[PDB]
Amino acid sequence: NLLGEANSFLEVLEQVSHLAPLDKPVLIIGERGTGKELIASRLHYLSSRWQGPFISLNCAALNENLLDSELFGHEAQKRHPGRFERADGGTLFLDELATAPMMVQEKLLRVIEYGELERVGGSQPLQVNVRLVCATNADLPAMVNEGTFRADLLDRLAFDVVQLPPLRERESDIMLMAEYFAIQMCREIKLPLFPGFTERARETLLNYRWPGNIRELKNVVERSVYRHGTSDYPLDDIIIDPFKRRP
Ligand SMILES: Nc1ncnc2c1ncn2[C@@H]1O[C@H](COP(=O)(O)O)[C@@H](O)[C@H]1O
Ligand SMILES: [Mg+2]
């Protein structure tokens, strides 16, 4: 579910509505917990491929050799397909791209341009039709300067860039989502009503940097509402760090 009405956030949805119909690769820039996969997804369902598959993959998770074959597959009942084939006629979401190895990056470029996967075993190359979407919170141009990311790929990958505003730059929305989250939590722990946040809880919420953004805000709130466990008076104690053993 998409929440938030801050200008920056709205301008993004607008950008997304126009980009989605195209087949050009899209690049999303943003911190963790900012909704990258959601946005990526939104692109898919608003596109013409909305009926094709929507695939995902977190590059940072696999080791070089594993990611390579996990992306373009390999010869295994008789063959192990890659996310590209599994996304054929659909969209492929590559998260944490900045972590992909040069080998893969280079290999990844060819596919984008040539629209085909290379293959061995006396088998002809594979033709794929995939709309690409990638996310990262890194400074790719910076990485191109350190030679850690291929400049040619960047030129090509980045048909256009979507940049999700971190939570701290949307303040307008911090109380809005906290309220929403608090309320879902009340429904689960069966509280009659959400009693609201004292000024202190607000001060806290609005002053935190929210490094984990929306995912963090959510967890902090549910946790907080739980510790409070009552509808008799406003929530005052915001548990940012579950490791501090309050009082
Ligand atoms: N507009 C939004 N409304 C509610 N939850 C969101 C929103 N955007 C992101 N999230 C949460 O943020 C997390 C993912 O963001 P990301 O790290 O970019 O994939 C997910 O747990 C979401 O469900
Ligand atoms: Mg994600």
Q: Which ligand is nearest to the CA of 33?
A: 1
Domain count, the chain: 2
Q: Read off the tokens for 178.
A: 């906290």
The ligand with the least distance to the CA atom of 34 is 1
- The helix (H) or strand (E) run that includes residue 180 is helix 172-188
Going from the Cα of 57 to the center of ligand 2, the distance in angstroms, rounded, reads: 9
Residues 159 and 192 in one domain: no
Provide the 3-class DSSP secondary structure of residue 187: helix
**Phi and psi angles of residue 112, each rounded to the nearest 5 degrees, phi first:** -50, -50
| Whole-number Å distance between alpha carbons of 184 and 131 | 35
Distance (angstroms) between ligand 1 centre and the Cα of 214 equals 6
| Same domain assignment for residues 150 and 188 | no
Provide the CATH number for the domain around residue 218.
Answer: 1.10.8.60
With the most atoms of ligand 1 within 8 angstroms of its CB, the residue from 215, 221, 222 to mutate is: 215
Residue 205 CB partners (closer than 8 Å, separation 6+): 174, 175, 178, 197, 217, 238
- Find out whether 96 is annotated in a ligand binding site: yes
* 198 assigned binding-site residue: no
Cβ-contact 190, 55 below 8 angstroms: no
Q: Which residues contact 58 (CB under 8 A, 6 or more apart)?
A: 95, 96
Q: Whose CA is nearest to atom 13 of ligand 1?
A: 33
CA 59 to chain centre: 12
Q: How far is CA 12 from the centre of its chain?
A: 14
Q: How was this structure determined?
A: X-ray
For residue 201, give its domain range: 168-247
Nearest to 182 by CA among 229, 132, 139: 229
Name the closest-CA residue to atom 9, ligand 1. 35
Q: Are residues 43 and 142 in the same domain?
A: yes
Instruction: Determine whether the shortest distance from the Cβ of 2 to ligand 1 is under 6 A.
Output: yes
Confirm or reject: Cβ of 205 under 6 Å from ligand 1: no
CA of 37 to the centre of ligand 2 (A): 5
| Judgement on whether residues 105 and 7 belong to the same structural domain of the protein | yes
Same-domain pairing of 155 and 192: no
136 and 198 belong to one structural domain: no
Distance 33 CA to ligand 2 centre (A): 7
Same domain, 148 and 94: yes
Tell whether 120 and 238 lie within a shared domain: no
- Residue 10 beta carbon below 6 angstroms from any ligand 1 atom: no
Looking at 147, 167, 187, which one is the last position of a domain?
Answer: 167
Secondary-structure breakdown of the chain: helix, strand, coil percentages, each rounded to the nearest 5: 50, 15, 40
Task: Indicate whether 31 and 1 sit together in one domain.
Answer: yes
Pocket of ligand 1 contains residue 4 by CB under 6 Å: yes
